[PDB]
Design a protein around this ligand. Structure first.
Ligand SMILES: *[C@@H]1O[C@H](CO)[C@@H](O[C@@H]2O[C@H](CO)[C@@H](O[C@@H]3O[C@H](CO[C@H]4O[C@H](CO[C@H]5O[C@H](CO)[C@@H](O)[C@H](O)[C@@H]5O)[C@@H](O)[C@H](O[C@H]5O[C@H](CO)[C@@H](O)[C@H](O)[C@@H]5O)[C@@H]4O)[C@@H](O)[C@H](O[C@H]4O[C@H](CO)[C@@H](O)[C@H](O)[C@@H]4O[C@H]4O[C@H](CO)[C@@H](O)[C@H](O)[C@@H]4O[C@H]4O[C@H](CO)[C@@H](O)[C@H](O)[C@@H]4O)[C@@H]3O)[C@H](O)[C@H]2NC(C)=O)[C@H](O)[C@H]1NC(C)=O
Ligand SMILES: *[C@@H]1O[C@H](CO)[C@@H](O[C@@H]2O[C@H](CO)[C@@H](O[C@@H]3O[C@H](CO[C@H]4O[C@H](CO[C@H]5O[C@H](CO)[C@@H](O)[C@H](O)[C@@H]5O)[C@@H](O)[C@H](O[C@H]5O[C@H](CO)[C@@H](O)[C@H](O)[C@@H]5O)[C@@H]4O)[C@@H](O)[C@H](O[C@H]4O[C@H](CO)[C@@H](O)[C@H](O)[C@@H]4O[C@H]4O[C@H](CO)[C@@H](O)[C@H](O)[C@@H]4O[C@H]4O[C@H](CO)[C@@H](O)[C@H](O)[C@@H]4O)[C@@H]3O)[C@H](O)[C@H]2NC(C)=O)[C@H](O)[C@H]1NC(C)=O
Ligand SMILES: *[C@@H]1O[C@H](CO)[C@@H](O[C@@H]2O[C@H](CO)[C@@H](O[C@@H]3O[C@H](CO[C@H]4O[C@H](CO[C@H]5O[C@H](CO)[C@@H](O)[C@H](O)[C@@H]5O)[C@@H](O)[C@H](O[C@H]5O[C@H](CO)[C@@H](O)[C@H](O)[C@@H]5O)[C@@H]4O)[C@@H](O)[C@H](O[C@H]4O[C@H](CO)[C@@H](O)[C@H](O)[C@@H]4O[C@H]4O[C@H](CO)[C@@H](O)[C@H](O)[C@@H]4O[C@H]4O[C@H](CO)[C@@H](O)[C@H](O)[C@@H]4O)[C@@H]3O)[C@H](O)[C@H]2NC(C)=O)[C@H](O)[C@H]1NC(C)=O
Ligand SMILES: *[C@@H]1O[C@H](CO)[C@@H](O[C@@H]2O[C@H](CO)[C@@H](O[C@@H]3O[C@H](CO[C@H]4O[C@H](CO[C@H]5O[C@H](CO)[C@@H](O)[C@H](O)[C@@H]5O)[C@@H](O)[C@H](O[C@H]5O[C@H](CO)[C@@H](O)[C@H](O)[C@@H]5O)[C@@H]4O)[C@@H](O)[C@H](O[C@H]4O[C@H](CO)[C@@H](O)[C@H](O)[C@@H]4O[C@H]4O[C@H](CO)[C@@H](O)[C@H](O)[C@@H]4O[C@H]4O[C@H](CO)[C@@H](O)[C@H](O)[C@@H]4O)[C@@H]3O)[C@H](O)[C@H]2NC(C)=O)[C@H](O)[C@H]1NC(C)=O
Ligand SMILES: CC(=O)N[C@@H]1[C@@H](O)[C@@H](F)[C@](F)(C(=O)O)O[C@H]1[C@H](O)[C@@H](C)O
Ligand SMILES: CC(=O)N[C@@H]1[C@@H](O)[C@@H](F)[C@](F)(C(=O)O)O[C@H]1[C@H](O)[C@@H](C)O
Ligand SMILES: CC(=O)N[C@@H]1[C@@H](O)[C@@H](F)[C@](F)(C(=O)O)O[C@H]1[C@H](O)[C@@H](C)O
Ligand SMILES: [Ca+2]
Ligand SMILES: [Ca+2]
Ligand SMILES: [Ca+2]
Ligand SMILES: [Ca+2]
Lengths: 388, 388, 388, 388
């Protein structure tokens, strides 16, 4: 009925409880489960659903051969019920393409899909399940967007796109949409040198995005957006708890306005919640590969270049595969504050598990508690051996 | 609540963006996907769906053997969610038969299915998912209709039927339906000599249909219907850009009131949008077989016998299979104009790929943009080798 | 909102058009289709659906072995969308048991299932999807009911049950339900000597049921019910067009108040519409087995012991298997009269096709037209060879 | 709209009619049926559904190997339509974990799932399909709850948890929830020495739970809760008809305030309805293993230490496998009283049927009749041989 406004703060995060898990690769061993990657979670006023990019085949399908590739004409943004797997029969196609984002503005859902060849890609912006606006590539090198949910405030839904080299300077823009129509866009500003795959959340009329500097930085860039004035800034997470992957070992002191060096031309989508003392960062446990996942509480991580962990929680053990991670919240829950949530993609298959010809994933998802809850670990749970 | 009226013009078409794609044959390699052909897309006020004629078997089913045949007791008009495949479990049967059309009039949906033996076929007209009216064959030779969506204006939904020889003079009629009841019908008029498979769209109280002259013409007949006066005329596309298949090479000058010769007794369902300078034609790239698909902008194609392309877009490369194509629009979108759309059927299997015993298809679908978007190609994406 | 009343007459029946067909056995060759039998069709105010008794296994399932048996703990009345097959994933269980009926009273649906051992069976009467009333066996020999839809009038839904021997005198009762509660019951009256499987329809405040005399009669008993006075009578179809199976050849003169002899202890569920000159009977074409199906127009069949066909239509050829047939109408359609409809069950497998270990069926369904439509035949379409 | 209140008494129970049955293991032999255990049935104001804990694989899936284990990261509370099987495509995930309960309070549904490692488990309380409250383990030894539906009264939904040893003293608590928020909790009181898996029902503003004393008792503990004063008491079923399994033979006299001895450290979830003369108990027929199920009418079982059966009904023969059983009622049915219902889990596979590597179950479910209905038996109906 009315546009949602970001009128609350974050709840205190004293730990993380299980929210959803699909067990897709297990289940898909003997059922009609789509091959996917780049998942996320987004809420409507009445429902939260899983989102991901289909590869246009089932996992047991012979067409699953070659699904390590990221971009093809057979991909599409899909959604499905929370904790169900993405099956042929239960999945709903939001739009066609190989990079996406999606959010609800209180009245209806905007979904964005980018398709095309590397040098001639275009985004299509859907609103109320109809195409409304199209944007052509501006740098002719894999126009791409967040791969997790955007956030709206009084109808304004900012979205971060990047076009250009993944391994050098690129052209990043922030589009401000309303009802699927472009109100304004800006080129990126502040001190982040490279931006990919922003994970966003909203509180008290401000939208905070934690991104991946694929070019230089093993600390993560952060973009803070004011959706009323439609302006933004950027910087890095100051903390020496480094949260990209691959990365170097943790130092004693980080950087606020520059990439922390030691790894080039690589990374992974990740996230944080940045709320003074109530600040928690996600990262893979391995500094070398996408394995494990932990949450660490790092007070003032954004602003304090010496900040270190005061608490943590294991989400996925270092002996199990992880992947992309991202942030969402249910902005339509009852109560005084917004409950921080995230998902972690559990990649299975290639390249790490190359006895199969496919790549897919399952999802685990958590939300914050004000209690100090016991922790478990939450692995994909499939046995590659069964797929041979 | 109220009947839809065709009160808007076409938007300017400066290119075509991806709308939907089902990847049915890929997916159906290892899931319960119905064998289909003769697909289309039609919108309701709240939903757009895929439509097609089922063959009453799955593709991996042994009953898929012999599905090259067009007419059997096992076919039915089905619909399903946009960009999902037509599966056993998600498909809804609109009605029984082997030739169809369907449209929504603003209040509810009319669907028409024709069944029977070649010399004793009948159409059944469903309205609000109940049978309302039946029409018997008048020429006792495969009564047939559009195989894509009809268009309504203030409750009046015209529909073009043909009965008679596919390879000589036939009896074409235009029925004007309202609430599933025949208001009036007319025999075909003007200068089109043969009509099959009209693809229709509506703008500014006029319904334009681009058809297939299976008998003589490699230019396409066009029927223009006035749904208020319930009258019509016909002619051919004047342009020397010839849009049937098979066809001869393009000449320098076409015909307005006569079939352009060089091919007999063959063709394919196709479409155009005919709007002065804002005119775009579809065609297969091959003049010999149903392969490739392109859009060409041909200003005043309907009226200018020398008109040639000023812009184009590749939809399917000449090394990939195509098929029937047709027009639809979402008449219930917001905005000042109607957005032209189309689909192309991607036929796989027989006769061209005869190492399998079946024929099926997938669908790609596009809509117009006012931007100049980059192009990709959109092939079916299945590997026949996997079905052996 | 309000109870439906039977305020209209029958439309004139000048032929029969195709309504629905599921192609279940074809489709079920390679998809998760339940084994069924004893199907029917029933309408709600917004929907018509297929109904049948599941056997609690899929057809390709190894548990399909032995599904020739009629009564087990694994059966259940299911419903599913019109012309879809009864799959594991789309079928809704109305109630548990091995004999049923079901109807909507304008406000909600009553469904009746009978289960139990042969000598201790019970009916459970569901209303608004809750159990409301239970009836115990009165003769301790396979309490059984109609196996097709009942008919309601101002909330009163009569239902015919039989309990006792199938091969000699039995105890037949007519229960008058309202909101699932027994208003009244009566023992059978008039001159019908044995009753099984009544097929019912309603017009002008009267409910007409055509049944099967399994004991003696190859003419069919008819029960006419007045749902206001809650009274009834019975007789036989006078016509020498004999409509049970197996049966003797047609004589020149039939019987009104006695079974026509020549076959004992056998039969099949069937139906008619009995409306003076507008009277049509169904029957198998074979006098020996359940093969073929035809409609014959037999003016005054109910009352004229010499009446013979004046028109007919083939529904299923004598070289294809048939089965049970029954009547339904959409009482909630628009228009001045009720459109007569029926279904025919197409039994496949045992006993006639004993190279498979199962028995199942598909459904074809027709409704009346005021036109004289061409006829086709409507066989199941599956190839037993594919199931070996 | 309004909170439900327990304003009615129980109907007279003169026997039990069939309610629902899923035939899941039969069906799942050749369809995509989830492996489950610990099922139950719960009603909403418009729907009753099946509930159970998924194991995160299909039964034919290779991941079904090892599903005898009770607690893993791959489990989840699911629900699905009544008498359908729990398939991949029709099942809805209520929440993640390996022990649960769920009820509707008249306005919406509360669902509780417990997950974690044995010494660090946590419950998450969902209300209106959002997480609202979390509780950490208090005794660090498999925090666990009812495994069947809770009962609400004016928004207050009590729930019994146990944490601690299964084979000695444990810490049992009764949480009183409203809208998913803890109003109050109490430690267990009265004379029950050990509590597991309470089966609850509600009548006349009182909630009665029949539980399992896993430590010492082969009679069952009973907890009676007053949801207005939020207080409770406990005792045992006095009757010498002993209802746990395994158990000793029935004595002539039981115990009211102490465990009846003869078996230690074992049991099964079960239930009763305790309503003076209208009292019925469930139990396995075997005193040694989970096989068979019967209902026995035992007047004043709760209060009379010499009470014996006056009537009974067989539900599952002693030659067929049973399992957990539990109570539910449709609190939103029409009529003057509440109809007692129950379900029995039919366990198949390990440990008893160890030629397969899995454990799963199907469900049978019954409700009370005021008639004296004939009885049948209701076995799972699957053939293990088919799974080899
Ligand atoms: C039941 O469930 C509960 C809930 O889950 C379980 O309890 C949880 O247990 C986990 C696991 O132990 C805890 O997570 C760890 O938390 C610590 C932080 O806690 C410590 O630090 C605090 C502050 O220290 C600073 O200030 C204090 C004084 O204020 C000062 O004394 C100190 O010297 C320092 O300057 C302390 O406040 C805190 O104490 C409190 O709580 C205690 C319980 O834990 C209790 O006993 C106390 O009495 C007191 O009340 C505590 O000491 C995180 O630091 C740790 O994270 C590090 O370690 C893991 C390895 O396990 C690693 O993966 C992380 O990445 C991280 O360490 C890496 O990064 C660091 C930062 O750069 C670096 O310093 C490290 O060298 C290391 O780096 C290397 O590896 C990384 C990663 O691969 C790589 O990138 C680098 O390059 C490099 O190679 C854990 O998150 C939970 O906090 C705790 N939760 C609760 C509520 O208690 C419980 O165990 C379960 N029960 C059972 C029975 O199983
Ligand atoms: C990123 O994405 C974009 C968007 O997709 C890509 O850009 C697009 O690129 C495509 C492919 O090149 C273009 O499609 C073609 O368009 C042309 C029309 O464009 C030309 O013609 C215009 C007018 O010429 C007339 O007037 C002018 C002056 O007004 C005069 O000079 C001229 O002599 C003539 O009289 C020009 O306006 C126009 O120029 C403008 O745009 C240029 C960019 O393209 C730019 O550089 C210019 O500076 C200027 O601003 C331009 O020259 C179509 O003609 C062409 O279609 C023909 O060719 C394809 C083969 O590719 C064929 O399949 C078609 O069927 C068709 O040719 C057949 O039919 C003709 C008609 O009968 C016949 O003449 C031909 O002989 C041929 O016939 C044979 O084959 C057919 C088919 O099999 C058979 O039936 C016959 O029997 C016979 O055998 C293409 O559609 C897009 O327009 C362009 N889009 C945009 C927005 O620019 C871009 O490449 C992508 N980027 C990357 C990096 O990949
Ligand atoms: C396109 O589609 C249309 C629509 O479907 C097709 O047209 C339809 O064609 C079918 C098939 O031919 C017709 O069905 C048959 O209808 C006849 C009834 O029609 C005749 O009878 C009328 C009256 O005769 C009586 O009165 C008249 C005068 O009033 C008098 O002259 C006569 O001697 C007699 O006393 C005539 O009115 C009627 O004529 C009109 O229509 C003609 C078109 O058909 C037209 O040419 C005329 O000019 C005129 O205007 C016509 O003569 C049914 O009788 C017949 O049913 C019997 O036959 C089939 C075998 O095919 C059988 O299966 C049936 O069971 C039945 O015969 C059995 O039962 C009888 C009753 O006891 C018994 O007498 C028989 O011996 C036989 O019994 C044996 O077998 C049974 C069954 O196995 C067994 O139980 C017994 O024991 C025993 O062994 C057909 O239903 C349609 O009516 C017709 N529809 C229309 C609208 O025209 C058209 O063909 C299709 N076009 C193409 C190109 O394919
Ligand atoms: C069609 O459907 C209907 C409906 O289902 C079928 O009719 C039903 O038939 C069943 C099966 O027979 C009946 O269930 C049994 O009910 C009896 C209770 O009924 C008897 O007891 C009453 C009272 O006796 C006491 O008072 C009376 C006087 O008031 C006094 O005379 C007597 O001495 C005693 O002190 C009688 O009122 C009642 O009579 C009435 O009804 C009769 C019909 O049944 C009719 O003929 C009469 O004329 C009269 O009107 C009747 O005599 C249950 O006791 C019995 O349950 C026990 O037996 C089964 C074995 O079958 C067992 O599994 C149970 O566990 C239980 O026995 C165990 O537990 C006892 C308690 O501790 C113990 O005493 C036993 O030793 C035994 O224990 C051993 O095994 C257990 C279990 O493994 C183990 O735990 C122990 O350790 C130990 O090893 C049945 O439930 C239905 O009541 C009846 N329903 C109706 C409505 O009639 C009908 O058959 C079907 N028709 C067809 C044609 O198939
Ligand atoms: C999932 C897993 O086994 N990850 C291991 C981790 O368990 C770990 F042992 C590791 F050495 C690592 O990168 O830290 O390597 C990972 C990976 O195997 C390797 C190719 O870098
Ligand atoms: C899809 C495809 O390979 N189409 C080719 C086209 O790629 C093309 F090469 C063609 F020669 C043509 O007809 O233009 O033939 C088509 C066809 O193979 C042949 C039987 O006419
Ligand atoms: C379906 C079919 O082939 N039915 C034939 C009919 O085609 C027919 F030939 C028949 F002889 C008949 O009973 O009329 O027999 C049926 C059956 O085969 C036999 C066992 O009685
Ligand atoms: Ca990086
Ligand atoms: Ca032609
Ligand atoms: Ca008979
Ligand atoms: Ca015990």
């Amino acid at each position: 009925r009315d546009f949602n406004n970001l009128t609350k703060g974050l709840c205190t995060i004293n730990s993380w409880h299980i929210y959803g898990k699909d067990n897709a690769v297990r289940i898909g061993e003997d059922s009609d489960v789509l091959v996917t990657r780049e998942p996320y979670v987004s809420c409507d006023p009445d429902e939260c659903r899983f989102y991901a990019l289909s590869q246009g085949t089932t996992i047991r399908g012979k067409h699953s051969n070659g699904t390590i590739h990221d971009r093809s004409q057979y991909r599409a943004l899909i959604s499905w019920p929370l904790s169900s797997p993405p099956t042929v029969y239960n999945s709903r196609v939001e739009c066609i393409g190989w990079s996406s984002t999606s959010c609800h503005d209180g009245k209806t859902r905007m979904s964005i899909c980018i398709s095309g060849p590397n040098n001639n890609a275009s985004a299509v912006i859907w609103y109320n399940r109809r195409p409304v606006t199209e944007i052509n590539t501006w740098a002719r090198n894999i126009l791409r967007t967040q791969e997790s949910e955007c956030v709206c405030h009084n109808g304004v839904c900012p979205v971060v796109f990047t076009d250009g080299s993944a391994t050098g300077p690129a052209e990043t823009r922030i589009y401000y949409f309303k009802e699927g129509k472009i109100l304004k866009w800006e080129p990126l500003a502040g001190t982040a040198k490279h931006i990919e795959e922003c994970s966003c959340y909203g509180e008290r009329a401000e939208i905070t995005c934690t991104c991946r500097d694929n070019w230089q930085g093993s600390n993560r860039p952060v973009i803070r957006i004011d959706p009323v004035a439609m302006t933004h800034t950027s910087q890095y997470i100051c903390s020496p708890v480094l949260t990209d992957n691959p990365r170097p070992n943790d130092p004693t002191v980080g950087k606020c306005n520059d990439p922390y060096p030691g790894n080039n031309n690589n990374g992974v989508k990740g996230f944080s919640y940045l709320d003074g003392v109530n600040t928690w960062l996600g990262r893979t446990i391995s500094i070398a590969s996408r394995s494990g996942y932990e949450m660490l509480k790092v007070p003032n991580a954004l602003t304090d270049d010496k900040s270190k962990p005061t608490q943590g929680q294991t989400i996925v053990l270092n002996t199990d595969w992880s992947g992309y991670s991202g942030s969402f919240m249910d902005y339509w829950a009852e109560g005084e504050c917004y409950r921080a949530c995230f998902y972690v993609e559990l990649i299975r298959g290639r390249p790490k598990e190359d006895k199969v010809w496919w790549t897919s994933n399952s999802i685990v998802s958590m939300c914050s508690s004000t209690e100090f809850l016991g922790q478990w670990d939450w692995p994909d749970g499939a046995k590659i051996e069964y797929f041979l």
